[PDB]
Amino acid sequence: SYQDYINCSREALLEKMAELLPEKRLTHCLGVERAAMELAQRFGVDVEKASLAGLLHDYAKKLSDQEFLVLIDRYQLDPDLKNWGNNVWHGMVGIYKIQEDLDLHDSEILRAIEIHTVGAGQMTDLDKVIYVADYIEHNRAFPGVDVAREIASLSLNKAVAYETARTVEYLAHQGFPIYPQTLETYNAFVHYL
Template identity: 50%
Template sequence: MMTTINYQQHLLPLSRQQLVDKLAEALTEDRFHHVLRVEQTAIKLAKQYGVDLEKASIAGLCHDYAKQRPDEDFLREIKEDGLDPDLLNWNNAIWHGIVGAEMVKHELDVWDEDILNAIRHHTTGAPVMSPLEQIIYMADYIEPGRSFAEVVKARELTAKSLTLGVAYQTEQTLAYLVERDLPVYPATILTYNAWVPQNKGEL
């Protein structure tokens, strides 16, 4: 059953339905339904872990806002906003979170830093993440549409502890990239070092 949050905190100048309508225009049908599932998963986790439900809804819906934008939009945003020039060496997998958060800020008028950080870090993680950031990081990974082998354990660990969920996802993500000889974004390594070793015995 879907939980619909009535936005009352003026965290953006839109109702939830107006935001959903914008996302329906910006994303393919599959991606749109993914963000709806992430929102619902984020709300469920926010209820469990005492996190603001409205922020969880907005961050969950907006986490992939920029996912299907053309590369030139990201490149322009990086240069115009004076973001880390190293971002120019990466691609959509990294940009849609880190650079996408700036697009959410400027285009949807969202200025809450916790929401923006949750969007920024939902793919790479970060050495320090607020409970909302952890929730979006995990909700994107474990939403009901996911069916990869590790997702069952990820869901179990997240239900037990956000910290364990974050550590497990980070461990699995790094292993996935290394096994396939894919480049690892530096923040992902920092996330691994901050979250995995001290929780290794419980994973």
């Protein structure tokens, strides 16, 4: 059960999350919970760790800059992190908030949440499941999501590569800064294409 990892039932979690998140963001999280379960089953990952990580991955989405900045100091994280924003922080720093609120201590789940936005050059199968599930969950409809879904039906590594390539391309297209760990992920996975 979820209580094996956090300090409340799935039902009570959803109630807590309904406070913290707009509906669309909660619906998304429920989408990722389902998508992560299906991927985990296909690629030999613990379906329960995947489901929970997937539901939790955007938990800290709506924390404010101030809190993140507080969390960076409190936990004495990489000081470079202050140079970035919500996109980077919600996973990379947001894990500390999850840990505070829900008493989550499982290292594999925490890591999968941590790098769900930017990945890493080395990713566990659980990390990849969350990273991909986030992208392909049934509520998303961005052009090319169908291709991501097909790829993910066949290869977890190739789905990581495709998603990462598309994010880097889109961020450069938009003129947005790109977190250097994202490029670590890109270069590590791009051969899979």
